[PDB]
Each structure stands twice: as C-alpha cells, then as structure tokens.
C-alpha cells in the first residue's frame, strides 16, 4: 500500500517515461500523421509579394 504519515500529503504522483533500447529498429518511411494543413499559413502568400 501507499503508507504515509499525517504531515505528508495523502496523495502522491508517478511520472512514467518510455524509451527504445539499442535493439530497436525502424523501417519503411512514411509521412507522419501528426501534422497537416488545410489553408496556407499566415504570411505564406506574402512571400510572393
């Protein structure tokens, strides 16, 4: 159990981390689905003016 004395905070936090090990390998490059655009960005048109 989480066991704490009266003057410690009754609730405590975990931070979780992840990494790859050095046996890790990646294959077949693709466009990442994490980014996109619908319009032009602001001031992009102005690069032509």
């Amino acid at each position: 159990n989480l066991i704490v004395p009266s003057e410690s905070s009754d609730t405590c936090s975990l931070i979780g981390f992840i990494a790859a090990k050095d046996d890790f390998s990646l294959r077949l490059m693709r466009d990442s689905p994490d980014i996109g655009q619908l319009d032009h960005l602001h001031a992009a048109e102005a690069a032509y003016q």
Binding site: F17, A19, D34, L41, H42, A43, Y48
Partner: protein, 289 residues
C-alpha cells in the same frame, strides 16, 4: 562511446539473479540520464543474433528526400489591363510554408546541407485549344540584387545571376544550391532579433537568408489565356544535424513564427495533446472473445 553501428544489438542468454547490493532495475531519473537497465538484467533471455539493419533511420536518409517548398499559380495572358502576377512571379525563399518538411526540419536545431532543387511546371487552358510548350526562366536573385519588375525588364538578361531556362515538355528542371549560410550551420530556430534596433524581426537568423526565386514565362503572351503552376521541391543532401528537439504538436499558424493555438479539442488541443479515454483503468481497444 562513439562507435560504428550497422545493426541492432544482439541479445545474450541470462540466468537467475540473486545478488545483494546489485539492483539493475532501480534507477535515478533526477540525474537526467536515461535508464541503463538491460533486458538481460530484467528477465531471463535467450541468445538472439540480431541482423536488423539501422540504415533507414540515418539522418541522411530521414531528411534527404524531395519535399515541396513553393507552389505558385499565375495567369499566362495579355496583362495590359490586369490589376496580379503578370506572366512572372517573385518568391522570397523560405522553408516554413509546407508543414511536412517544416516539421521534419524542426526536429533539429542546426542543419548543414546542400539543396537539390526540382522545378515542376504544369499548364491548363483558362475557361480548350491544347497545351502550349512554353519556355520558362528561373533566376536566383541573391540579397541586395535587383528583382525584375516586368516580364520583359532587362533584369532577365542575367549577366551574373544564375538562371535556368527550361521547357514544359522537358523533365523537371534540376539544380543543386550549395550550403550557403554565412555560419557553419543553418539556424533552424533562432532565439534572437535580426537587427541592431529593437524593431527587427524575432525568430529569423539573418545569417540564413537565401534570396529570391524569380520565374517568368519567356514567350510573348498568346491570344488566349493559360494558368501556369510552378512547384519547387527541395532535397537536403550531405547533411549534418545537431541538437534534436521536441516535435511540433500544435498546428502551425504562421510562417513568421512558432505561434500556437491548437485544435478545438484533443488530439493536439492546447490542453490535451492525446485524445481522452474514460479513465486510467480503461483499455481503449481491449481484446474480448
């Protein structure tokens, strides 16, 4: 230690462990080091001879593929009465306009590379007569050179500017620009102001200024109008990269800055980058049979 790595590491067999004072799964994140716990320390392993190559994650391979950096459409017509790109355009060269290349490049702080440029041109008849085989001129106009004001201005005589002349029926025009920063690397990010006064631009290293790409149709206008679209692709090559960064999460807003708003709701909202699940005990795609 710096070493040559071509394949992923092998796994050794491991036995039972029961040693006092030896505790390889315990770590201290506060040092800032990543965990050094090996699998052979955490579980009993078998021997595995690992053949998986690591070449596809080379920074050269990761970055050196051609990406769209500029796309412009203009009317090829008689422009005597237009308000407009009058048979030519000028582009102030930047990499911030197209998010897929922008996000890849911004994984790094400093980059040194040469740029392979491909120019792809396409033509459509304005609202048919067939498509003309036009000649185009692309002229690099460096910092402080004069840009053309007209399709037939004498700037296009190009005595010292690099120009390439190319046809629409040809393969795409291709040139390499050398690495041309006045520093040893481009500043992908710049925590500074461009000028000696306070009013100068934030976020753009003056050292990285390339110049202008000016593109005209060389032909006189025809009796009918066309739309010409020019696409510029850039491929980094002979790449060096330094100090990798947290990737962009929020949608870009502007080419001038890193300003951020996020999507209205997760994923990639300012308040929540990952989409919500019901609780920390909920397994979203749980296998049930």
């Amino acid at each position: 230690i710096e070493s040559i790595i071509k394949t992923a590491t092998d796994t050794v067999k491991s036995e039972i462990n029961a040693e006092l004072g030896v505790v390889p799964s315990l770590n201290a994140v506060e040092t800032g080091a990543t965990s050094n716990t090996e699998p052979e320390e955490a579980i009993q392993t078998r021997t595995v001879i690992n053949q998986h190559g690591v070449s596809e994650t080379l920074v050269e391979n990761f970055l050196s593929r051609a990406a769209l950096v500029s796309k412009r459409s203009f009317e090829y017509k008689d422009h005597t009465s237009s308000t407009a790109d009058k048979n030519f355009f000028k582009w102030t060269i930047n990499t911030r306009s197209f998010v897929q290349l922008r996000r890849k490049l911004e994984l790094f702080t400093y980059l040194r590379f040469d740029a392979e440029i491909t120019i792809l041109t396409t033509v459509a008849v304005n609202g048919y007569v067939g498509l003309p085989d036009l000649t185009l001129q692309a002229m690099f106009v460096p910092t402080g050179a004069l840009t053309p004001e007209k399709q037939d201005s004498f700037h296009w005589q190009s005595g010292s500017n690099a120009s390439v002349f190319f046809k629409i029926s040809d393969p795409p025009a291709r040139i390499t620009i050398p690495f041309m920063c006045i520093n040893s690397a481009y500043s992908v990010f710049y925590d500074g102001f461009a000028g000696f006064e306070k009013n100068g631009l934030y976020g753009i290293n003056p050292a990285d200024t390339i110049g202008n790409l000016c593109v005209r149709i060389v032909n006189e206008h025809q009796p009918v109008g066309f739309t010409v679209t020019v696409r510029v692709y850039m491929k980094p090559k002979h790449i060096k990269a330094w100090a990798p960064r947290p990737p962009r999460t929020l949608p870009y807003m502007s080419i001038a800055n890193a300003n951020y708003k996020g999507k209205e709701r997760a994923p990639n909202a300012l308040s929540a980058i990952i989409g919500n699940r019901d609780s920390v005990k909920t397994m979203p795609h749980n296998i049930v049979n």
